[PDB]
Every structure is written in C-alpha cells, then in structure tokens.
Amino acid sequence: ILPRISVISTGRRRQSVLNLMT
Amino acid sequence: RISVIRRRQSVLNLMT
Amino acid sequence: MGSMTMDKSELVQKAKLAEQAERYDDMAAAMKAVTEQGHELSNEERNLLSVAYKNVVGARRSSWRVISSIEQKTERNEKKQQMGKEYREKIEAELQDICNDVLELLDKYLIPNATQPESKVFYLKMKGDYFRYLSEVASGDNKQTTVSNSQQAYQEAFEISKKEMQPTHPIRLGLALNFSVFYYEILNSPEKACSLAKTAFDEAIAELNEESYKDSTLIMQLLRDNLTLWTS
Amino acid sequence: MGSMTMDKSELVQKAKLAEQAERYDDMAAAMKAVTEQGHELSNEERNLLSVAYKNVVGARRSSWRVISSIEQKTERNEKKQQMGKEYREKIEAELQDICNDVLELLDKYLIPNATQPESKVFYLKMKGDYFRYLSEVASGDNKQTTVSNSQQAYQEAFEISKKEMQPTHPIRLGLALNFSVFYYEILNSPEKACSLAKTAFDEAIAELDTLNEESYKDSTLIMQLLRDNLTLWT
Amino acid sequence: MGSMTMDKSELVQKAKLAEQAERYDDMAAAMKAVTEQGHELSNEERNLLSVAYKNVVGARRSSWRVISSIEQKTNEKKQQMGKEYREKIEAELQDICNDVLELLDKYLIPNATQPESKVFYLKMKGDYFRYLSEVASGDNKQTTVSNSQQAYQEAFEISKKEMQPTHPIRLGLALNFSVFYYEILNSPEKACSLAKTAFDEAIAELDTLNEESYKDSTLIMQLLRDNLTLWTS
Amino acid sequence: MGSMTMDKSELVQKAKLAEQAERYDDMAAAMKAVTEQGHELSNEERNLLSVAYKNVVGARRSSWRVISSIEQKTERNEKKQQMGKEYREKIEAELQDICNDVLELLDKYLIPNATQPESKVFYLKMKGDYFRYLSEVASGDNKQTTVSNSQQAYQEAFEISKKEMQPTHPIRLGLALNFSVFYYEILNSPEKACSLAKTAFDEAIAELDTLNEESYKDSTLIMQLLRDNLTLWT
C-alpha cells in the first residue's frame, strides 16, 4: 500500500489586497 | 506522522 | 450459494471476514444462520454473534440518541419537527426489528440449548439487555411490558448467577453491571441500582490466578465508575 | 406526484438529519431524490450530495481494501481464499452500483444544468473521482474504459479551472489534489503527480501572499494536503 | 554579527530565510534594516518588506478582531480583562504601524523615482494609516483617517493618469481605497461606487481570449466583485 | 506580590483569551505563572499548559526543519550556507530554551505534585516528549543525554500505565503513540515502533469490543492515529 490523501469534505469578510509585482 | 498531547457503562462478556 | 446450503464453518469464516470489513450487518446475518442450525454455540461462535449484534443494534442506538437530541433543539418549527419525528420513528423501527431478531434467537435456540449455568446466565443477561434496548425507545403503550420483560430476564439471570457462580465470575459481574444500569436508567430506581452494584462489587472484592484476577477487576472497575457517576 | 411525495426542503432536512446520525446511505438516497427532481442544486445541496456519496462509496472502498488485503495474504487456506474472493466481488458490485448512480446523476442532471464555470469544474471533478473509484477495482478492458473516462473528465475540469478560476480557489485546488492522486495511484506516475501538486501548491502560495488568509481557510487546508502528499511521495 | 555591520545582500538573504521559516518578525527586522540603509528598494526587496510587515501587522489585526469580538459577547471581570488584553494588542499594532510609516516617510516615498513605485508606496501609506484607524479612538483617529485618505487620494490620481485600468496596482488601490470608504468612513455608497467603476473599466479592457496572461488582474477584479456582492446583499 | 500579581483565575482567563487570539507565547507565559504557584493543575489547566507549549515549541520545530533542509541543499554558496548555519543555531537555542522551561516545570512542580497514576503518566509522557524535541536537534554527548532521558521518562510512564490504566485510556494510548514515534524517529527502530503501536491498538480494540464506544471517542481518535502511523511506517 502506497499512502496518499485525496480531498476531504469542505462544507464573508471584505477583501483587501497587497500587490507583489514580480 | 502524528503525535498527541462521562456516561454510564454497560458490558458485553467476551470469554476467551 | 446461500446460507441454507452452507456449513457452520463457512458461515463463521464469512462472519470473521465481515467483522474485519466493518460490515456488521453481514456479520450478524452469518451468525444468525449459524445459530439457526440449532447446535449449541461454541465460545468463539457466541462471541462473534454477540459482537455482531452489539454493533448492529449499537449503530441504531447511537443514531437514535443523536436524532432525539436534535428534536429537542428544534421544537419551534413544524416541518423540521415532523421530519425529525418521522426519521426517529424510522430508526426506532430498525432497532425494534434488530432486537426482535435477537430475542427470537435467544428464545428459540440460545437459551434452550444452553447446557451450563454460565451459558444460561449469559443468554438471560443478553435477553435482559435487548429488552432494555427496546425499553430505551419504547412507546408509552408498550413500555411497561418491555421493561417488565427486561427485568424478568435479568432477575432470572441474577438468581441463577447467585446460586451457581462465583462472585468474581465476569459474567456474574457483568450481569450486575447491566442490571444496575437497568434499575437506574430504565426503572428510575437509583437507590436499588447503587445497592445492586455496590453489593456485587463488595462481594467480589472479598473473594479476590493472575488471569482470572485481570478479567474480574475490569468489570469491577466499571461498577465503581457507575457508582461514582450516580452518587455525584 | 408519485412514490417520492416529500418536497425538496423535506428531503434536504432528511439528508441533514441522516448526516448527523451517520446514516449515509439514507443521506445519499435523499440527495439523489433531490437531484432527480430537476432542481439545479444550491451550493449547500451540492455539498450534501457530495458528502453523502463520498461516505457511501468510501465505506465500500475501505471494506474492499480490507478484504483484498486479507485475500492476498491468505496463502495456504484455499477455502478462505475462495470466500475472500467472493466477498470481494460482492463488495465490488456494490461499489460499481454506487458509482453508476453518481455518474448517472452527473450525466443526466448535474453537468448539463451547470451554467457557471465553478459548478462545471465541481461536477467534472466529481465525474473524474467516481471513474477513478471504479478504476480502483476494475480490470481488463473495463479498466481501460474507466481510466480513460476519469482522465478525460479531470482534464476538462482542469482546463476550465485554469482559464476561469484563481489558483487559490478551493475547487481548483481540490481538483489539482485529486488529479495528482489519479496520476500517482491510477497511472503510477509519481513524478508527474508531484509536478502537478507542486505547481498547484506554489501558484496558490504566491497568490495567497497577497491576500487575507483568514478568508481562505478551505484553500489553506487543501494546500496542506498537497504538501503532505508531496512529503509522502518524495 | 549585527545589522549595522551587514551588507544589503546579507540582510536580504536573512529575510528570505526568515520567510521560509515563517519567522516574520525576523523577516521584517531584516528588511527594515535594508530600508534604513537609504537606497531605493528593488522590486524583490519591496515585496520582501511588504510581505513581512503584512504578516507582522496582520497577526495583531486578527488577534485584535478576535478579542474585540469576545469583548462584545460578554461579566465585568472577563470584560475588563478583554479590554486590557485588547489594549495590549493595540499598543503592539500602533508600534508596528508607526515603524512602517516611519520607513515610508523617511526612506521609501522620497526615494520613489517611477510613478508605479510612488503609487505603490502611497497605497501602502494609506493601508497602514487605515490599520491605525481601525483601532484609533476619539481624538487621534481624525489624524490617521485624514492621513489615510490623503495618501490614497494622491495614489488614486497618479494611478488614473499613469496606469491602464487592468493594472494590478490601480486595481488593488481601488479595492483598498473602497474598503477605507466602506469601513473607516462609513460611506457604503462611495465605497460601492469606487469598486464598481474599477471593475467596469477593467472588464472593458481585459483580453477575455487570453485571460491566462492576466491572472494578476483578474484576481483583483474578482475581489472587487466579491466586495460589491457582500456589501449590496 | 512581585512583578506578577494576577491570581490563578485571572491567569487562566488570560490564557484562554491568548489561545483564542492565537498568541501562544502569551498563553504559555500565563500557564507557566499558574504552574509556578505550586498547586496541582486541574485537567483544564493541564491542557492549557500543554497546548500553549506545544504551539510555542512546534513553531521552532517547524522552522528548524525548514532551515536545516535549506542548509544542506546549498552546495556552492559558502555564504548562504554559513548564514543558514547561524540561523539554524539561533532557532535551536530558542527551542532549547523552551524545552528547558517545560522540563523545569515538570521537575519542580508537575511530576512531584502528581499522585494519581493518570497524572504521573501524563507528565512523564510530557517529559519524554520534550526530551524528544531536544533530541531532534541535539548532537554529540548532549544527544546521548537527551535520548536517554526521553526514553527513561517514556519507559517509566509506560510501566505505570500498563499496571494502573486500561488499554482504552486516552493517556495510555497517547503515550503509546508518542513512544512509538520516539522509537521510529529518534532511535531509528521501526520494528520496535510498529510493535509498540500495533500492540497498543490491538489491546484497545479488544477491550472496546466489550464496551459501549460512545464514551470512548477520544480513545478511538488516538487509535486512528496509531492506525495512520502504522500505515506510513510499513
């Protein structure tokens, strides 16, 4: 058996942003 | 790997 | 093939596979067919049958408690209240079918085939247990009879166990534990419940092999835990 | 008006009760009845359907792995071998029936009614997932069919997600996670799986650095799953 | 060894190591020392400074929101301990913000030679005065609110003349400036107007056929739409 | 009386606030001050202490792993490698100071005030844990000292738990889990680690077969971790 994880069950605040110009 | 830091009891007898 | 063409050894092998697969409904069905062949069950067969139904009925008891807890937290909306009631009744009906199947096995095969007193006490306790589980969900009209049937089975087990078994025997101790739970939770008779559990404990502690000491003390500890919870 | 007389709100409440009671077969039957009534599912109803079938199929996948491992570790005992084989095949048939029902719902109701890219990625990922579950137990030409169908569904979802969603979107992240598992386990391609998971992780982390992470806890949970698989696989 | 005997490149290497270690106080201290050497930051050094302080200040902002929330759901004993603990966090937050604003006034803004750099640092000044304004009570609030609005307004004017509507900094400035209006100034209409204008002008210019090439722009377009949805619901 | 003038209830309330605010340095300082008052901790206080220091030391353990990894991948740059070394050593010193404070607390207050077996096992396991964290970064003869001290603390907790606690007790199970990690990671003995973990899982599942599993949810969760660690280890 080779272990691995698939996605589990997953089941509102205003957003601000920082610019990171590469 | 993981490491870590009531109601009344009734019983079933499982004789070996 | 089908259970009615299988030898007991094949059904037991099926039960052990089902247990590993956590498929307890399959496990109980195999052991039900073993029981219905009419032989007295071996210790191993008895353990497989008891574990299987403990888990089958235990899933429904746990679900019934969860839904019941939800019902009293939503007592102010008609559609959700009636959905909760119908779903609880559906679970109750499954639980009742499971317990009736076990009680039928007990009366038709297990209790009549029991040749030793220890076996008779075990299966009478089991009868008391499954009538107790019916009592946990019983309607108002049926509760008196299911409660009476539970008490009668536990009492017959209790009288045999006091006559035929050492106070230290884990089945005698386990009967006392579950009978005291019956008195406390079903019969709402906590003085009798504590009296029963203390006397059982105190009778075993006075009579205390390294292997017979280990098994008896675990249930004695459960008696102590319930007494602590109940006198708190 | 027919055999199913409850309306959608009753079925959804029944599904939520079944979930709390850990009765997932009941939960799946309720959400299947909701889906079959033609309603385009809400986000809440979509999640209920996915949780229900994840647990229904997950129980059979787990039992199948246990019985398979017992059957393969049974050397001398012939009758135990044959019984394990028959039990495995009985569980396989249940698993195939469950996946068939889900894929039927997806092809008949869910994917054709998904108008928003998020819903189309979600259901195409689900299609990839359930063909992957069939591929875990299939053999021969049937396995060729399920592996191909799973890859095609994941690939379409993947392309849509990269055009229409940001790297930090939890559905896009969960798709990358399961597609990487498909490469790792079904296609036995661990380096391609690691490369996928690492790009998804790195592109999400770079975008996350510009954001308030408190609003993306579902994303960060999945990024940790990506990182855990990378640890396991490297 | 000591920051005052270190070259810029060694401090940057330290900042990068601290970032990988998720030790953001260490990262901020290194980039503060870089900035205090007085030379204009490269793009990489700007990103390292900005990420470090976003995380340093952000931990305190998030604690402050948690403690403020518990203050309301409450008992005079628990409520006065929450008020003291909150004032503890407020004091750290004010120290962090004043350090950043000191860096902006003494080094970053007077060294900004290109308009994009000037808009970025003015947006940053607006942000950190906004973070001060999130906790400023009574008197001092009027100065930080005014200093925030002033910094944003000037960046807004440069950005509209110098940047295309799809430019991530023009989009990000509009996003944060609208948050300022909604939350600090309690002007939800002007906040919604600013965010909707920014979204509409960007979607009018965006190459829909090559959205792959503009994920930096579409990120903030989605954030603007998110805020408008949240606010009008 | 001196510089710290909060009473025990005020300190516990502040610990609870700091936990909600994710300020674990504050939380640990509060619970350290509670412990230094010298009274036996309640289960609630014992958990607050344990959770605070787990988070404080865990941040350093995480950073140490990242920096030590970078330090060993820098093949050419002797200056990225010297700075990486000094930074790793700075983190190690922090970790060593945190473990020192916990081990101080255990020897001065927690272990001497433990009279019930359940409390002795919990604190001896904690002693084993923090000597294990020191062992993760120690070298030379200091590692010999920390490894032996970890093992001796675990072994003592192990023998007490075997004699006084049921196999389903969560503290006994958690001890088995961490002791097996010690064998696997610190002693590099995977067979010893796997045997300890499976035996603990097996004895617990045998006893749970007799009990109603509803009041043992915390035992079951640790059994699932034992399961998971065994899955990874073999």
From E13's Cα to the closest Cα of chain F, the distance in A is: 7
Nearest alpha-carbon partner for A15 in D119, D166, D201, D225: D166
User: First and final CA of chain B: distance in angstroms?
Assistant: 35
CB count within 10 Å of CB D132 equals 24
Specify whether the CB–CB gap between F53 and F39 falls below 8 A.
no
Calculate helix-pair angle for E76-103, E115-133, nearest 10 degrees.
Answer: 160
Token output for F12: 């516990």
DSSP C14-57: HHHHHHHTT-HHHHHHHHHHHHHT-PPPPHHHHHHHHHHHHHHH
Q: Rounded to an integer, what distance in angstroms lies between the CA atom of residue F68 and that of residue F57?
A: 16
User: Which of E51, E175, E183 shows the shortest C-beta gap to A17?
Assistant: E175
Q: Please, is F191 exposed, middle or buried when counting C-beta atoms within 10 Å of its C-beta (0-12, 13-18, 19+)? A: exposed
The encoded tokens of residue C43 equal: 């210790």
Cα distances (Å, whole numbers) of residue E25 to D125, D209, E15, E28, E90: 40, 16, 10, 5, 17
Dihedral sign (CA F133, F134, F140, F144): negative
Q: What are phi and psi of F211, to 5 degrees?
A: -110, 165
Q: What are the b/e assignments for D1-36, b being 16+ CB within 10 Å?
A: eeeeebebebbbbbbbbbbebebbebbbbbbbbbbe
The torsion angles phi and psi of D66, rounded to 5 degrees, stand at -65, -50
Structure tokens at C219: 């249930």
Q: Is the dihedral of CA C41, C44, C50, C53 positive or negative?
A: negative
Q: Two tokens at F98?
A: 């945190």
Domain tally, chain C: 1
What gap in Å lies between CA D111 and CA D105, rounded to an integer? 9
**F233/E contact by beta carbon, under 8 A:** no
* Residue environment code for F87-123, b if the CB has 16+ CB neighbours within 10 A, otherwise e: bbebbbebbbebbebbbebbeebbbeebeebbbbbbb
Spatial separation of the C-alpha atoms in residues D234 and C59, rounded to whole Å: 40
Chains touching D (at least 3 CB pairs under 8 A) are: A, C, E
Three-class SS of chain A: CCCCCCCCCCCCCCCCCCCCCC
User: How far is the C-alpha of C228 from the C-alpha of E73, rounded, in Å?
Assistant: 36
**In the block, residue with structure tokens 């900035």:** E35
Query: Taking CB atoms and an 8 Å limit, are D162 and E212 in contact across chains?
Result: yes
Interface test with C, best of D12, D22, D23 (most C CBs within 10 A): D23
A12 contact residues in D (CB cutoff 8 A): 215
Q: Obtained via which technique?
A: X-ray
CA-nearest of D169, D208, D97 to A7 is D169
- Please write down the long-range contacts of C6-11, taking CB distance under 8 Å and 24 or more positions apart: C6/C33, C8/C34, C8/C37, C8/C39, C8/C45, C10/D79, C10/D83
CA distance B16 to E21: 54
Q: How many Cβ atoms sit within 10 Å of the Cβ of residue E230? A: 13
Rounded alpha-carbon distances, angstroms, from residue F215 to C170, D71, D96, D118, F220: 21, 34, 36, 41, 10
**CB-based contacts of F79, cutoff 8 Å, min separation 6:** E10, E13
Which one of E85, E90, E93 would you mutate to disrupt binding with F, by most F Cβ within 10 Å of its Cβ?
A: E85
Amino acid in position C173: L
Among C residues 138-197, those touching chain F with beta carbons less than 8 Å apart: none
Is residue C16 within 8 Å of D71, Cβ to Cβ? no
Nearest to D228 by CA among D198, D206, D203, D188: D198
How far apart are alpha carbons D66 and D71 in whole angstroms? 9
Residue E145 CA to residue E133 CA, distance in Å, equals: 6
Interchain CB contact of A11 with D (< 8 Å): yes
Cβ-proximal residues to F46 (8 Å cutoff; 6+ apart), any chain: F122
The answer, for A3 touching chain F at a CB cutoff of 8 Å, is yes
Sign of the CA dihedral with C192 first, then C196, C201, and C202 last: positive
Question: For testing the chain F interface, which of C44, C50, C54, C171 should be mutated: the one with the most F CBs within 10 Å?
Answer: C54
Distance (Å, whole) CA E201 – CA E165: 6
Distance from CA of A20 to the nearest CA of F (A): 23
User: Alpha-carbon distance E150 to C152, whole Å?
Assistant: 86
- In degrees, to the nearest 5, what angle opens at C-alpha E11 toward C-alphas E5 and E17? 140
The single-letter DSSP state of residue D40 is P
Q: D3 in a domain, yes or no?
A: no
DSSP string for C70-130: HHTT-TT-HHHHHHHHHHHHHHHHHHHHHHHHHHHHIIIIIHHH--SHHHHHHHHHHHHHH
**How far off is chain C from B5, nearest CA to CA, in Å?**
25
Q: Which two tokens stand for residue E30?
A: 């290194």
Distance from CA of F201 to the nearest CA of C (A): 14
What does the alpha-carbon distance between residue D191 and residue D198 come to, in Å, rounded to a whole number?
10
Tell me the residue type at E192: C
Closest CA to E185 of E151, E140, E134, E226: E134
Q: Are C51 and F209 an interchain contact pair (Cβ–Cβ within 8 Å)?
A: yes
What CATH number corresponds to the domain at position E193? 1.20.190.20
Please name the amino acid found at residue F166.
Answer: Q
What share of residues in chain C are helix, strand, coil (percent, to 5)? 85, 0, 15
In SS3 terms, chain E reads as CCHHHCCHHHHHHHHHHHHHCCCHHHHHHHHHHHHHCCCCCCHHHHHHHHHHHHHHHHHHHHHHHHHHHHHHCCCHHHHHHHHHHHHHHHHHHHHHHHHHHHHHHHHHCCCCCCHHHHHHHHHHHHHHHHHHHCCCCHHHHHHHHHHHHHHHHHHHHHHHHHCCCCCHHHHHHHHHHHHHHHHHCCCHHHHHHHHHHHHHHHHHHCCHHHHHHHHHHHHHHHHHHHHHHHHHC
CA torsion E150-E151-E156-E158 (nearest 10°) is 110
Cα dihedral sign, E68-E72-E73-E78 = positive
Spatial separation of the C-alpha atoms in residues C111 and C40, rounded to whole Å: 9
Q: How far apart are CA C106 and CA C123, in angstroms?
A: 7
Cβ contacts (< 8 Å) between A3 and chain F: which residues?
A: 231-232
Q: Do chains F and C touch (3 or more CB pairs under 8 A)?
A: yes
How many CB atoms sit inside 10 A of residue D49's CB? 24
CA-based nearest residue in chain D for residue E210: D163
Rounded Cα–Cα distance for residues B11 and D203 (Å): 54
d(CA E6, CA F232): 45
Q: The domain containing residue E167 runs over which residues?
A: 3-232
Determine the Cα–Cα distance for residues C49 and C98; give it in Å rounded to an integer.
Answer: 13
Partner chains of B (3+ C-beta pairs under 8 Å): C, F
D163, D208, E172, E231, F65 from E218: Cα distances, Å: 11, 14, 11, 20, 36
Token pair of F177, please?
A: 């889990």
> Does the distance separating the beta carbons of B12 and C219 come in below 8 Å?
no
Per-residue burial over B1-16, b = 16 or more CB atoms within 10 Å of its CB, e = otherwise: eebbeeebbbbbbbee
Look at residue F134 and give its three-state secondary structure.
helix
Residue E55 CA to residue F95 CA, distance in Å, equals 22
| Chain E residue nearest residue D169, CA to CA | E219
* C-alpha to C-alpha distance for E159 and E139, rounded to whole angstroms: 31
Which of F207, F209, F214 lies at the smallest CB-CB distance from C62? Answer: F214
Asked if F41 and F33 count as a contact pair (C-beta separation under 8 A), the reply is: no
Residues 6+ apart with CB under 8 A from C171: B13, B15, C118, C121, C122, C125, C161, C165
- Tokens found for residue D45: 């109803």
Contact residues, chain B, for F209 at CB < 8 Å? 12, 14
Sign, Cα dihedral of F140, F142, F143, F148: positive
* CA distances, D13 to each of C227, D16, D44, E126 (Å): 40, 5, 12, 48
Phi-psi domain of D213 (left: phi exceeds 0; alpha: psi -120 through 50; beta: other): alpha
How far apart CA E67 and CA F40 sit, in angstroms, is 29
Listed in sequence order, the residues at least 6 apart from D63 whose beta carbon sits closer than 8 Å to its beta carbon are C21, C22, C23, D91
Cα E142 from Cα C183, distance rounded (Å): 71
| C50 within 8 A of B14, measured Cβ to Cβ | yes
User: CB-based contacts of F234: which residues, under 8 Å, 6+ apart?
Assistant: F190, F194
Q: Most B CBs within 10 Å: which of F178, F188, F194, as the mutation test of the B interface?
A: F178
CB contact under 8 A, F213 and C51: no
Q: Does E50 touch chain D (CB under 8 A)?
A: no
Task: Report the C-alpha gap between E223 and A17 in whole angstroms.
Answer: 8
Specify whether the CB–CB gap between E166 and E205 falls below 8 A: yes
Measured CA distances, E158 to C140, D16, E119 (Å): 79, 54, 7
Q: C67: distance to nearest CA of chain D, Å?
A: 7
**Can you tell me the distance from the alpha carbon of E173 to that of E127, in angstroms, rounded to the nearest whole number?**
9
Beta carbons of E126 and E176 less than 8 angstroms apart: yes
Q: Contact F66/E10, CB-based, under 8 Å?
A: no
Q: Which residues are CB-neighbours of F128 under 8 A, at least 6 positions away?
A: F150, F151, F153, F154, F157, F178, F179, F182
φ, ψ of residue B11 in degrees (nearest 5)? -135, 145
Nearest to D212 among A4, A10, A15 (CB): A15
How many other CB atoms sit within 10 Å of the CB of residue E75?
9
> Residue C173 gets which letter from DSSP?
H
Q: Burial level of D55, CB count in 10 A (0-12/13-18/19+)?
A: middle
CA dist A15 to C106, D33, E174, E231, Å? 65, 38, 12, 11
Give dist(CA E107, CA E65) in Å, integer. 31
**Sign of the four-CA dihedral D196, D197, D198, D201:** positive
Q: Token digits for D227?
A: 């990182």
The whole-angstrom distance between F62's CA and the closest CA on chain A is 21
**Location of structure tokens 């746990």:** C62
Instruction: Return the structure tokens found at F128.
Output: 């084993």
Nearest Cα to A14, choosing from D40, E183, C152? E183
Classify B11 as helix, strand or coil.
Answer: strand
D197-204: long-range pairs with CB below 8 Å, 24+: D197/D226, D197/D229, D197/D230, D197/D233, D198/D226, D198/D230, D200/D167, D200/D172, D200/D173, D200/D176, D200/D226, D201/D226, D201/D227, D201/D230, D203/D167, D204/D167, D204/D168, D204/D173
**Site of tokens 């033609």:** D38
Dihedral pair phi/psi, residue F19, rounded to 5°:
-65, -40
Burial of E186 (0-12, 13-18, 19+ CB in 10 A): exposed
Cα C113 to Cα C108, C126, C130, E155, distances in angstroms = 9, 15, 19, 92
Sequence-distant (≥ 6) Cβ neighbours of residue D137 within 8 angstroms = D64, D92, D95, D96
Query: Residue D105 in contact with residue D129, Cβ under 8 Å?
Result: no
Say which of C17, C59, C83 has its CB closest to residue D13.
C83
Buried b (16+ CB within 10 A) or exposed e, E127-154: bbbbbbbbbbeeeeeeebbebbbebbeb
SS3 call for D191: helix
Question: Is D2 inside a domain boundary?
Answer: no
Q: How far apart are CA C58 and CA C61, in angstroms?
A: 5
Residues F230 and F192: their CA atoms lie apart, in Å, by 12
Contacts of D204 (CB under 8 A, 6+ apart): D167, D168, D173, D219, D223
Cα→Cα distances D46→B3, D101, D105, E95, Å: 35, 15, 12, 46
Decide if D181 is inside a domain. yes
Cβ contact F56:F31 at 8 Å: no
